[PDB]
């Protein structure tokens, strides 16, 4: 609690300080982003200095062949006026902002930026080696600038921007142990195939083995040839039009057959991790400040209540690949699958890595 | 309108504070 993060405009007319870079979203109370902008009066002009907080969406357009091109279309923006104190926005600064005036005097004016819930966390989509431009996804940024008024122009030298990531973490208590049963009886034989699956726990931290206990109760004529185990990232993307996707991130195809009319019990352990998923351009990563190697995207925690942004989640799938033929031939699928949902995120660190 | 961007500004640095 003695280190602050500063960033100055290239021309030095605007230096922005911040207390932290990651601002935790407990689903109830979202940590606020608070800081001061130090206006060098030597390099001052009589043009208001504003500070704005933008939640936006960096996408690279698909038709435009050009590399490095990203478009930012914002979702939540806030405009805090801090050029004079003259307007009636008299607000009690924090103990962060209190120490900062003590350091820099009444030339560092404070902004008290407030982040609502029901707004997305910072989530980056993995770029191909094709891509060389800014990181695509959802990212928050605060920029401080100078202009005669808000509808005026903003010169890049008369402005400075810093990107912050809104994060989340594994709650204190865990959820129940996840478990599911989906059970197809088949057309020709009335005796059923009953799939039972469970996970050892509902909350895994990144890079931890998930172990999946599978219980098969085959009472069919049909012979389960293969068992397919997939850990599978679900991603809900809300924008002007809504688009979802289920990608897999750590799987294995086990050739454990189950006979006709035999019980089968085996537990399968699988860790997700980004290395074996590099190829999956567009998979959901966690937030990147500039370019670092972010892990697989943490689940996104939701309250009781077309919710905005990009909503990661996980479910481990358990498919049984079932013998065909006999009556309908190869025309009707016979498989039986089960999805166990679970939350995968980080622990609350009571948070950057060797950089260069 | 809707705005574009290029590749990767300034370097982000840190200063210290009062130990209150």
């Amino acid at each position: 609690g003695t280190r602050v993060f500063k960033k100055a405009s290239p021309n030095g007319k605007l230096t922005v300080y911040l207390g932290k870079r990651d601002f935790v979203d407990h689903i109830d109370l979202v940590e606020p982003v608070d800081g001061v902008v130090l206006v060098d009066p030597e390099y001052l002009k009589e043009r208001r200095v504003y500070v704005t907080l933008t939640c936006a969406f960096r996408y690279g357009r698909e038709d435009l062949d050009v590399l490095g091109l990203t478009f930012r279309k914002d979702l939540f923006v806030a405009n805090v006026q801090s050029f004079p104190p003259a307007p009636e926005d008299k607000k009690p600064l924090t103990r962060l902002q209190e120490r900062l005036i003590k350091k820099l005097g009444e030339h560092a004016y404070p902004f008290t930026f407030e982040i609502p819930p029901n707004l997305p966390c910072s989530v980056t989509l993995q770029p191909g080696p094709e891509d060389t431009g800014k990181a695509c996804g959802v990212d928050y940024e605060v920029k401080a600038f100078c202009a005669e008024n808000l509808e005026e122009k903003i010169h890049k030298r008369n402005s400075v921007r810093l990107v912050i990531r809104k994060v989340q973490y594994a709650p204190e208590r865990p959820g129940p142990q996840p478990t599911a049963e989906t059970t197809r009886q088949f057309l020709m034989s009335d005796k059923p195939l009953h799939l039972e699956a469970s996970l050892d726990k509902e909350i895994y931290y990144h890079g931890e083995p998930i172990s999946v206990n599978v219980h098969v109760t085959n009472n069919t004529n049909k012979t389960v040839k293969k068992i397919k185990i997939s850990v599978r990232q679900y991603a809900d993307i809300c924008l002007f039009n809504t688009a979802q996707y289920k990608c897999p991130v750590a799987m294995e195809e086990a050739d454990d057959t189950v006979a006709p009319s035999s019980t089968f019990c085996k537990v399968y352990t699988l860790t997700p991790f980004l290395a074996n998923n590099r190829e999956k351009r567009g998979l959901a990563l966690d937030g990147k400040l500039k370019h670092e190697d972010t892990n697989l995207a943490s689940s996104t925690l939701l309250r009781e209540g077309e919710i905005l942004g990009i909503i990661v989640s996980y479910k481990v799938k358990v498919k049984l690949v079932v013998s065909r033929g006999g009556l309908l031939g190869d025309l009707a699928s016979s498989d039986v699958a089960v999805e166990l949902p679970f939350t995968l995120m980080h622990p609350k660190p009571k948070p950057h890595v060797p950089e260069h | 309108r809707t705005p574009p961007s290029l590749g990767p500004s300034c370097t982000t640095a840190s200063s210290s504070l009062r130990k209150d």
Partner: antibody
Amino acid sequence: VQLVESGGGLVQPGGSLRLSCAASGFNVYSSSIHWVRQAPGKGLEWVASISSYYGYTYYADSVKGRFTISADTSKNTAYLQMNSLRAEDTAVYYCARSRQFWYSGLDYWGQGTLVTVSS
Amino acid sequence: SDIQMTQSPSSLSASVGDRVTITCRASQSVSSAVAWYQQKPGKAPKLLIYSASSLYSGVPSRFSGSRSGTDFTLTISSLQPEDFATYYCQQYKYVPVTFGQGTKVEIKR
């Protein structure tokens, strides 16, 4: 909750030696492994690191063309192939976890493996 | 270039119950990514403090440290028999992570 070091020993210079580091007590995927080299009458010197989760390896400049670091995450160990060994290259060699996410210093180590190289 | 970490008390001797400290400087801004390790010879190193101020778990509260720009200090308030060894400062900002040359605490008698 322990790392154990094997394979250290005495090799003729120019030669090679391959060290094993059998981890246990954590998840090789949420940890990342390092090799610290510490001469007897001298200090500490990191040589090699490997995040199986992100897949990258990093090396200390003095051992680029001669040292290889690996990880057999099935059997939850990691290996240091030390090729083309010199006289500077002798030390005790330690294995060392870190947090494979948000590096908070080398927390757990193992007692070491003695690597001797002279003619 | 590489980052040089130098512990300025090459040797030191003191007594049980002192506030003794070790200092370590870095070649350039390591931005409070510094650890501190203890090590009695033969036996392996053990970790004490990470990021210069956060004390590791299972580590006694009498330990702490301080950053003053490039200069990093290790503080120990009322030492015990357990706290007698050589002490090492590490940086881990830049990839070539480095270590101080080694501050050995003696015993005053």
